[PDB]
Amino acid sequence: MVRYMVTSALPYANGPIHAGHLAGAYLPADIFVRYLRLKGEDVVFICGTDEHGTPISFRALKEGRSPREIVDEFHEQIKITFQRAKISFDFFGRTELPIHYKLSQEFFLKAYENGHLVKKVTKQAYCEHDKMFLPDRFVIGTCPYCGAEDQKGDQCEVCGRPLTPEILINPRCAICGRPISFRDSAHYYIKMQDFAERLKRWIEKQPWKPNVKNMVLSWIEEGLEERAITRDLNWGIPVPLDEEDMKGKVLYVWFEAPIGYISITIEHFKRIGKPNEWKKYWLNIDGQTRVIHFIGKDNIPFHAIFWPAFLMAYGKYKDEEVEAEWNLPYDIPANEYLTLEGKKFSTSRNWAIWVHEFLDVFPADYLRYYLTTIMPETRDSDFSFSDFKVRINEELVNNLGNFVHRALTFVNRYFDGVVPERGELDELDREALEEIEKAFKEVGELIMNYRFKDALKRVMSLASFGNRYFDHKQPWKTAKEDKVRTGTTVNISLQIVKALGILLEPFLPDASEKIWHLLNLDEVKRWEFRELPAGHKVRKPEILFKKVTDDQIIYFILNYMAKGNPEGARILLDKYYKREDVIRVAKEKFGDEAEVVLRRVYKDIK
Amino acid sequence: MVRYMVTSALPYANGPIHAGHLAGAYLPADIFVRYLRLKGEDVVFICGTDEHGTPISFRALKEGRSPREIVDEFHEQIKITFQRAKISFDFFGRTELPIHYKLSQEFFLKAYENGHLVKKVTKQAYCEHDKMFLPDRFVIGTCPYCGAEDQKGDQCEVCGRPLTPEILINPRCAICGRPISFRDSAHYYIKMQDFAERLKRWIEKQPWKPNVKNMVLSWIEEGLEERAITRDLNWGIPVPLDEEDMKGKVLYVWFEAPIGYISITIEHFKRIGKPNEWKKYWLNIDGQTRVIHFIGKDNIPFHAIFWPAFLMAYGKYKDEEVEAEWNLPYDIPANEYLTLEGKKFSTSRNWAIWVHEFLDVFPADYLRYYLTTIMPETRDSDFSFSDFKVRINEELVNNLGNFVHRALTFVNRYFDGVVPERGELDELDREALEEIEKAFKEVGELIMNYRFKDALKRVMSLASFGNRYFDHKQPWKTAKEDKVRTGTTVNISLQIVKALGILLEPFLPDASEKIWHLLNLDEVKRWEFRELPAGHKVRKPEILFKKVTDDQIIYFILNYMAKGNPEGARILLDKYYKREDVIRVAKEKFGDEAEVVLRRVYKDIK
């Protein structure tokens, strides 16, 4: 019996998360883990904020704040956001945890000890007016492909994606604009080549899709250049070595980050009261823990190559309990990117769907539903507002919500909300109870295969099946002729609602508890279905979902989207709506300030 | 060995919580429970949203939304807010839980069964244009003391506090203004008189303060009028009785609400995996569970009289395990009200400090610190912005934060962050380690006595003691003469920081983890102090707290306070600040909209 150690790529504590992030590695992981829990399986779901690296440091000088100040701010912002998103991480830690410092440092020390490292002195950047080295994101120059002013790290705003700090033209320190200087420095490196073979061999015998497995093999087919794992940063985890040359140096966040996956788990079992249980999840003791890594496509290389090697370089974990080895990525589910109304998410262009903002106007189920509806699985998908409301209202409201409502509304009208007893069953009755079985079976398999968009579809169809059932069983007619008959229809219909109650859970937790209350159940939610007993008391018909409005979308676009990118807003607005309508919404939404918005989006209007 | 069943008054799901609420019953409870946990004691901390009652129903017709829609919205808003507030409820449920429905209904049925009830028909309100009864908050008329138009429930906006629905002049249904009608109805009542004696007797033998114990006794000294526990509402828990007269009737929220205290706990142990542990907390088995009820003064009567009786009326709980009785309120800590800048919190006047808004500009420690600083213990206290910043900056920043910073900054300057070994100890060294003991001892006692304002003070003084220590031990001098000496000072100083790390926890969780990371500790936080070992590696000097700004307060007042109550804002602004300063802050804070604010607060300015 396998147990599961599930993680989600650590979000960087330099900003808030957007739907691309969620759709990319959190929502999938949540859907998967919830399922596993309903299955009764043994799974741990971990995550936390990545709090080191040049960026965070950069931003600190930028806003004149300590790197600690900002990560403390974003850890809270993100942890709460995930709670809002209903992402059930068993624990959400942070790489600022003392234990992370200890484990990373050990990790590095284990690499020292197995001669997988190599000190090296290189000539590198510097500022004399600021008396400090100038790592990655401090580069401030022209581009490496196109030629634009001011380019940092490796993302751009031009065409540029990945522009090493040196291929940049006119190197000038970002902090003060002083043209860079060159001071040589010492850093330790990892002889990745030491694991190329062992890696390739391991990758061979593994259930990953060729589109990855292979491309990975290729990438390895040409040596692994010794990568540096140290940095000249004033923020981060100190390199253990007590020498004078390694003073004021830190472990490349690039190296310690993944170790966070273990650090946090350990932290989890500590505070949970069972200090040593973590060992069975990350250590290959009587080996059989499937370690899953939900990530974004960009993380495949790292997770299928370097991270595994970092683990190997620590050959032996060993004290007071088995000297076993670290497990390796069982699987590394990755998702493509997400676009917004035809364009890519852009923090620069301030064009994205921020979870915390979006969740201010729409319920979590809506964001979770639609996003799974467009899960960037095999390719990229495009978030669209017209697409969003239409799927919710047409699918979630008109179908799932509709069925549930009808069902209850009937058991309440003809039986005073008491579950009728079932008489003989004809073909449909027989087929309906079978469909319930089919769903549980198939949805479960689709999930274990990372086919969420299709898994959610299998569920919606069951609701679709329920509607049909009702539509052509006509309880409103049958009730004026054959009581017993209607009783069956009704009882059967509710069975489908209870089932839809458990099946939905992994996808929409809230619409799940909503249904459970309507059915009035204490029953611990589980994947093994059990019919609703006759004589069971159900609650009065409530509503499941309220249709998305244009008033809402406009309010959203105007209130968030707009200031940050007025043109983006304007283009969206007079693309879906008439200006005479937006004004009205704006007027009856922003009181004595509506006017100082409309003019802000529609360049000139007064 | 006692275990503790701690609760906080269920917040009503009709709106967000404000500092008065927090200061009144949540913050106290949190400080108490955290302590208990650090003490290693066995405590359960429960709470959830009260989701029934006329109000919620009212609001529903008001905004044309189902009562369920709104409670779902506020349960999320409040649960997240509490997370933001760092209130560690072991579980935050809701009275919409199926189990609540079951337990309440049983409770009522147990009262039926022990003849503590009495059906009665009364002539009551109605609307014929709306074909519905008109309970409490539907009353819409002139006042009962002063004479003002439109008065609902029992709170006012005039002078009025508690105006029974009938003493109101010109009774007109609130929904449509149609002057009320009178249709007789049947409701069950509880013969409170049946418990007067048994109550008074119980209250006698109990450790409550006379100012309560007595006033309670008086209140009881004149019969307990049979109170109605049923209602003509379409939203709520159905009365079990299957009769045609009790159809469409519900249990007065007033009756079921407290039962939520048990419902949720049960729900807690269910989902936690240990289904039956709840029995030992609410049932008096081998009796010794101290049940504490953190509430507001307004709740004393209810919690010391009716709630206990409701418990008695259920004489026997009994199946498959001991037929024991429900425990009774061990203690019922209550706090006075809170005022804002000299005036009372007012949802009507839109004058209050909303936790979720306030926590958008200031860290949770700041709100928790200041509020405990003004805990409405023996009387009412007044929240004030000048008072807020001054205490934070002068106390939290300049003292606690200052000490911590100095300490680390030294162990890092003269020992490369490594804990020095202690040599001979003189009087101060000896006294310093003793002070640490004293603090733990006294703070702990002050907490167990609900003396938080003083408990927090005992802690700040320890930090104050640390500063003095340092000030007159002069490490910066001693380091250029006697190494060993400085080592002691330093080692000692850090002991005080680690201690301040645990002591703070109950009050400021974040400044607590901040200190723990600086000290670089894995050690599970506990109330039993253990010195920092020599040779221990501490982190580089960070900052603990950033001083509150005027830019912040103005931004807050302008961004939240203002629209909702522009006059309130204006009066605050040009009372603390010059208009030429507010403008600047407003201009460099609201970009292209600053102008449409300043004019909104300062009536005319252009």
Ligand SMILES: [Zn+2]
């Ligand atoms: Zn470029």
Ligand SMILES: [Zn+2]
């Ligand atoms: Zn510079």
Ligand SMILES: [Zn+2]
């Ligand atoms: Zn009045």
Ligand SMILES: [Zn+2]
């Ligand atoms: Zn009316």
